[PDB]
Every structure is written in structure tokens, then in C-alpha cells.
Design a protein around this ligand. Structure first.
Ligand SMILES: CO[C@H]1[C@H](O)[C@@H](O)[C@@H](O[C@H]2[C@H](O[C@@H]3CO[C@@H](O)[C@H](O)[C@H]3O)OC[C@@H](O)[C@@H]2O)O[C@@H]1C(=O)O
Length: 452
């Protein structure tokens, strides 16, 4: 009588903080160059819960560079004060590489409440190599002594000031990172920390945040390693400072998020993309690296197998013809073109809202991959990734709690080769939703308590 998926609300796993992306390295500046119509279409496809992906997290870069040449993110303190005991020279431009505008829109127009500010590097004058690019380490960490002096507290004060500048512009930074890919030396903003050096810095940053006049004390994150395997390798050294930070972060480049890390903290997958793959907007062709289907399955893997509480693609909107970004902007034409990778992330984010709890679901046939989430508002979202033909599915709840009320209505949306989070029939009868899950799709079925 169709396949029945039964949600067990009494078996719970990780909280979901949400889904998102970045506009770092002046990708936000590229959005700002669009006509007003195009700016709003780019902001809608990213953040709109009615006509967009409903992304619920924005990752901002804490600019390290002396200026905005090339795609560099200028620092709030680009000029050296000479000694780390001298006051830092802040030169706040009220733009932050156009990330403040994107943030203000995300928060005030679209209701986003999670903002993750992550430094790729300290300013060059705070580092062993005197540059924010080409690796090097923060002056004054163990094994990183500098003629210029110990810049560790100055770096903590600087990160705190950046958060303060966002606060005074009506945006709360909720999460704060001080490194990115700390195993990697690159030709752009980059900075090398060992796990011990990360733990040493957290000892200094934590009391700096805790003692500050910040209205909201942001959660310290570590360490945006390039994969699960590399980040897992840092957790031993980090365990001595588990009382001093509250978020573990890693990318999906050098390994996949396929296992639960041994950490007490929530874990986010903060960066993945097909960075160099030829642009495609396709949902499904053959399961290649850029296809919407592939990315819908990557998010599934990170949440169900990696115990991720969040999933961020690298870039939202950007110019150029690789899959590093979800949304193509043609600066000439003033056009915005979402790939089916944007719709893949949205097929999660629209229905699995911040503060959702992952809950057990059973009944899936071999062609179906399923997961279920109970939202803070009591709505229950059930993900079905269908690798087979169309599949008639029934969705129902069970609980061991008599406080859990039966749902009063259901709706369903699908993304596939012809649909972008398009509503499909959800035939509801006495607590059960019946849906025809399209061939080669990700479908989400949501059961709603009565608003009336
Ligand atoms: C087609 O060039 C693309 C690059 O090949 C690709 O790596 C990316 O380059 C960005 C760079 O992205 C980093 C990817 O590695 C991560 O560890 C790191 O966090 C990211 O920052 O970021 C710096 C920026 O200057 C490069 O452009 O995207 C390139 C693109 O043009 O899309």
C-alpha cells in the first residue's frame, strides 16, 4: 500500500544549526555590482524561505589584507602599529568587502540569525613571514617567535574588535574562527597552526571574548581543517581547552564527512564545492562532481554518517565558469542563474530550520535514502532521496510521549531535472501523508501541527 516511512520522535540524534555559504574574497562585491533587480534576485535565491534556498547560515571572511586589490579582503587594521603593545590602527570602512551589506540583508530582510566570522590569516605584521598570504604563523605562539614581539593578545583584541564593528552595524556574529585550512600554505590568505598552537591561542581568545563588552559572546570555532580526517587529528590537543570553545569545523576536500568525530561539541561541515569542475546547472546527468543530485547526496552523507549539525557550500553567487559557487552571476548581462546545487541545498534548508533535532525514520526500500527532523515549531520534515522510478510513499509519526500531538496537515516539495523545490501533491488523511516521490529526486514531506 505504498512504502510507509514511520518517524520515531522518541529516538533523537544531533541538533541542526542550519545550511549556508560564503561571499568572501569580494564575491559580495561582485553581487554589489549587479543592477538593483539582480542584487535582490541573488539575495532571494540564497536566503528567501518562499522563492529561494532559505539558507540559514552566512560564513564571512575576517579580512587579513592591506587593501582590496585583486579579490583580497581588506583588514579592519591593515597598517602595522609597530609594537604589539601599541594600539591597533582600526580603519573601519562600514563595508567589510561588501559582506556587511549581505549580512544586514540576510539578518533584517530574510531572518538569518547565525553569522560565522572566520579569519584565513592574521594581518601580515602579526606573523612570522610579515604577510597575510604564503602561510606563516601568528607571532608569539610556541615555535613562532618574532623580532617584532608577541602578537597573540593583539590578534585576540583584533578579532573581538571585528565582532564589535558588526555589533555596532546591527549584526550579531554568533560564531568566531581564527584559522582556516591551518595545514595549508597557499598564495592567498593562509596561516599555519598546529593543534597545540590552536589550543594555545584558544586559551588567550576565550578570556578576551568573555571579559569583553560584546552584547552577544560568540562561540569560538576550530579549526576549518580541509577534511574530517585532518580535523579529527587535532581533537586530542584541543581536548585540554574543550571548556573554552563550542564548535568543531571542517571542510570536505581532503576527506569526506563519513564518521562521527569524538568531540563533545557540535560539528559543522563549513566548506565543500566542485572548485574547478566546468560549470553545470544540471540536477542529474551521470552523477558527475557538479550535479545537483551529487550535492543532495553529499549533504545526506555529512548529516546522517558525519553527524554534522550544519553544511555550507563554499560560495553562493560569483562570476566565472567553475562549480566553486552555487549561483552564476554574469556581470555584463546583470543575470543571476542558480545551479541545481543551490536547489539541492535549499531542498534541505527550506524545511529543516535552525534548532531542528534529527529523529529516527524507518521503512525505506533500497531505492530510498531517508532522514527526519523535528523543527522547533513542531513541524516534522522527512527527506527522501529516490534513486529509482516514481515511488508512492506514506509518511506517519509515532512517539512514546503523550505530549506529542498528531499533525493536522502535510505539504511536499521535490527537486529533480524539471523541478526547483516545486510543491507536489501531499494527500493527507488522519495523521498520514501520501506522496508520489518523483524518479531521481530529493523530495521533502512536512507534517504540520494545526496553526488554528
Ligand atoms: C577557478 O579558480 C577557483 C580555484 O581553483 C578555487 O580553489 C577557488 O579559489 C579561491 C580560494 O578558495 C579556497 C579553496 O580552498 C579552501 O581551503 C579555502 O577556504 C578557500 O578560500 O579562495 C581564495 C580566492 O582568491 C580563490 O579565488 O575558487 C576559484 C574560482 O575562481 O572560483
Amino acid at each position: 500500500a505504498g512504502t510507509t516511512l514511520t518517524v520515531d520522535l522518541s529516538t533523537t540524534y544531533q541538533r541542526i544549526d542550519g545550511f549556508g555559504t560564503s561571499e568572501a574574497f569580494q564575491r559580495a562585491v561582485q553581487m554589489s555590482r549587479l543592477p538593483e533587480e539582480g542584487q535582490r534576485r541573488a539575495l532571494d535565491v540564497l536566503f528567501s524561505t518562499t522563492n529561494g534556498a532559505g539558507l540559514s547560515i552566512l560564513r564571512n571572511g575576517i579580512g587579513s589584507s592591506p587593501d582590496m586589490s585583486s579579490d583580497h579582503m581588506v583588514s579592519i587594521a591593515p597598517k602595522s602599529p609597530g609594537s604589539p603593545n601599541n594600539p591597533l590602527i582600526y580603519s573601519w570602512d562600514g563595508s567589510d568587502n561588501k559582506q556587511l551589506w549581505v549580512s544586514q540583508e540576510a539578518v533584517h530582510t530574510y531572518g538569518v540569525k547565525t553569522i560565522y566570522a572566520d579569519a584565513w590569516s592574521a594581518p601580515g605584521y602579526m606573523k612570522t613571514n610579515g604577510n597575510d598570504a604564503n602561510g606563516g604563523t601568528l607571532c608569539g605562539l610556541s615555535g613562532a617567535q618574532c623580532a617584532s614581539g608577541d602578537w597573540r593578545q593583539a590578534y585576540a583584541d583584533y578579532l573581538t574588535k571585528y565582532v564589535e564593528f558588526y555589533q555596532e552595524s546591527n549584526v550579531t556574529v554568533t560564531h568566531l574562527g581564527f584559522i582556516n585550512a591551518p595545514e595549508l600554505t597557499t598564495s592567498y590568505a593562509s596561516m599555519r597552526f598546529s593543534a597545540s598552537q590552536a589550543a594555545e591561542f584558544i586559551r588567550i581568545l576565550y578570556p578576551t571574548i568573555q571579559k569583553s563588552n560584546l552584547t552577544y559572546k560568540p562561540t569560538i570555532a576550530c579549526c576549518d581543517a580541509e577534511g574530517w580526517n585532518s580535523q579529527a587529528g587535532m581533537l586530542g590537543a584541543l581536548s585540554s581547552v574543550n571548556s573554552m570553545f563550542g564548535l568543531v569545523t571542517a571542510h570536505a576536500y581532503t576527506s569526506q564527512p563519513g564518521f562521527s568525530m569524538n568531540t563533545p561539541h557540535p560539528v559543522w561541515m563549513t566548506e565543500a564545492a566542485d572548485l574547478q569542475g566546468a560549470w553545470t546547472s544540471a540536477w542529474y546527468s551521470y552523477g558527475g562532481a557538479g550535479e545537483g543530485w551529487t550535492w543532495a547526496n553529499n549533504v545526506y552523507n555529512a548529516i546522517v554518517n558525519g553527524n554534522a549539525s550544519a553544511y555550507l557550500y563554499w560560495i553562493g553567487a560569483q562570476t566565472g565558469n567553475t562549480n566553486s559557487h552555487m549561483v552564476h552571476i554574469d556581470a555584463n548581462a546583470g543575470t543571476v542563474e542558480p545551479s541545481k546545487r543551490l536547489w539541492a541545498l535549499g531542498q534541505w534548508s527550506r524545511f529543516v530550520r535552525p534548532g531542528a533535532r534529527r529523529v529516527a525514520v524507518s521503512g525505506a526500500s533500497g531505492s530510498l535514502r531517508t532522514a527526519a527532523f523535528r523543527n522547533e515549531d513542531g513541524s516534522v520534515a522527512v527527506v527522501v532521496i529516490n534513486s529509482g522510478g516514481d515511488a508512492a510513499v506514506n509518511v506517519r509519526l509515532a512517539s512514546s510521549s503523550s505530549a506529542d500531538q498528531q499533525p493536522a496537515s502535510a505539504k511536499a516539495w521535490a527537486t529533480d531535472n524539471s523541478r526547483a523545490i516545486e510543491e507536489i501533491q501531499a494527500s493527507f488523511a488522519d495523521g498520514v501523508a501520501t506522496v508520489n516521490v518523483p524518479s531521481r529526486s530529493m523530495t521533502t514531506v512536512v507534517l504540520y501541527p494545526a496553526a488554528d
